[PDB]
Design a protein around this ligand. Structure first.
Ligand SMILES: CC(C)c1nc2ccc(Cl)cc2c(-c2ccccc2)c1C(=O)O
Length: 133
């Protein structure tokens, strides 16, 4: 298991719990409708400890870059300005976001050749699955 195994362009094939996660975040109706109906690609590139994650669809595209282990200001899809850290740990990329005394974790793992993305805030969870393209 290495962070490099997560590289490439990945296409969303299954979502569960995403709308609920967005309601927990407090996302408004315009963006929730967009997120319910987008089928984005995820594009992950990594060079050593440098990581970029771009999420791309007609409806909505976002991108961030970071150094693994380093705290940075991430502007999210829904416009939060979080203190984020990403680490590759026990075979998963773990992204922890902190803002206004709130927290959310997003994990990304390779399973059976598919990218599995899991999100949680206050026990409200989502699982999104991507196949490689
Ligand atoms: C971190 C992840 C679960 C995520 N969280 C979000 C949290 C809130 C919103 Cl409004 C969007 C997202 C979007 C996302 C970005 C573009 C198209 C569809 C979904 C994504 C995404 O797929 O990158």
């Amino acid at each position: 298991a290495t962070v490099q195994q997560l590289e490439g362009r990945w296409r969303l094939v299954d979502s569960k719990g995403f709308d609920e996660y967005m309601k927990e975040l407090g996302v408004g109706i315009a963006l929730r409708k967009m997120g319910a109906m987008a089928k984005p690609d995820c594009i992950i590139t990594c060079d050593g400890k440098n990581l970029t994650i771009k999420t791309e669809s007609t409806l909505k595209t976002t991108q961030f870059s970071c150094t693994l282990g380093e705290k940075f200001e991430e502007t999210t899809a829904d416009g939060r300005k979080t203190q984020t850290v990403c680490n590759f740990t026990d075979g998963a990329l773990v992204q922890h976001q902190e803002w206004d005394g709130k927290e959310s974790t997003i994990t990304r793992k390779l399973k059976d050749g598919k990218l599995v993305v899991e999100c949680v805030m206050n026990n409200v969870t989502c699982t999104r699955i991507y196949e490689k393209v």
